[PDB]
Amino acid sequence: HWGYGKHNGPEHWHKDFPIAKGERQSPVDIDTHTAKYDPSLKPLSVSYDQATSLRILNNGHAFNVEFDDSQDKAVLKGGPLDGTYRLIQFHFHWGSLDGQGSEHTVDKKKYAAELHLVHWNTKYGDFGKAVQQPDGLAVLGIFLKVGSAKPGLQKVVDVLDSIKTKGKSADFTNFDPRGLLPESLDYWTYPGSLTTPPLLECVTWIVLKEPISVSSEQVLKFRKLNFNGEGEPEELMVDNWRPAQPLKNRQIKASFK
Ligand SMILES: [Zn+2]
């Protein structure tokens, strides 16, 4: 199947998912000097007060914290977006070492990890129909660097022992995703795709400029997860990131001067 190893990783994905070589693939390098400030962007609105987390799941590629998206409980609006996008899950990509792990890069800089908060456009009714649309999804991306601990991350780190292997899940109610956000909502935005198979070109990317800091100990617990299932040979879940893809005919916009 697909994965991140030598034999089924990003260089091989195109054989089953030919859109991998398409015109609006993600991630990309964000060249900060070439991004254009757009005064037309409206402020970003992150409204997570009534988010309802439900469960955390190791899917063999990352872990997802899942939300109740049957009502507008946690939504993203404004910025480059038309309409309302509802939070359905978040997950991370991370490295085997602190010098790598992010999917997007900033002037070729790789961060230790990258958080993706995934939202679908409520005009399409549910996630599955949204990923048949060029404006179906909005993913809020946040970089992680290693430094001081992020207190709002610690409940996630502490449940990882219960979902070590592919297919395990655990209750994960009453988690507040606002505790994963940096102070500033300054961002870059561009049209792109899912960064894993099926690599569908449905995503408005919104990448925050300000990273959050997490401790060495917190990201080390990410690296103890497993890609394999229970009872199978252990393969640590590390380096589950896709490298930067060609920008092609795209412009990255900045919300800030
Ligand atoms: Zn992701």
Curated annotation (Swiss-Prot):
Q: What is the effect of changing V139 to F/Y?
A: Strongly impaired activity
Q: Which residues form the active site?
A: H61
- Spell out the activity regulation: Activated by X-ray, histamine, L-adrenaline, L- and D-phenylalanine, L- and D-histidine, L-His-OMe and beta-Ala-His (carnosine).
* Outcome recorded upon mutating A62F: Reduced activity
What does the annotation give as the result of altering T196H? Higher affinity for bicarbonate. Enhanced proton transfer capacity
Tell me what the record says results from N59T.
Reduced activity
Q: What is the effect of changing E103 to A/Q?
A: Strongly reduced CO(2) hydrase activity
> What more does the record tell us?
Target of drugs used in treatments against glaucoma disorder and breast cancer.
Listed name of the protein: Carbonic anhydrase 2
Taxonomic source organism:
Homo sapiens
Encoded by which gene?
CA2
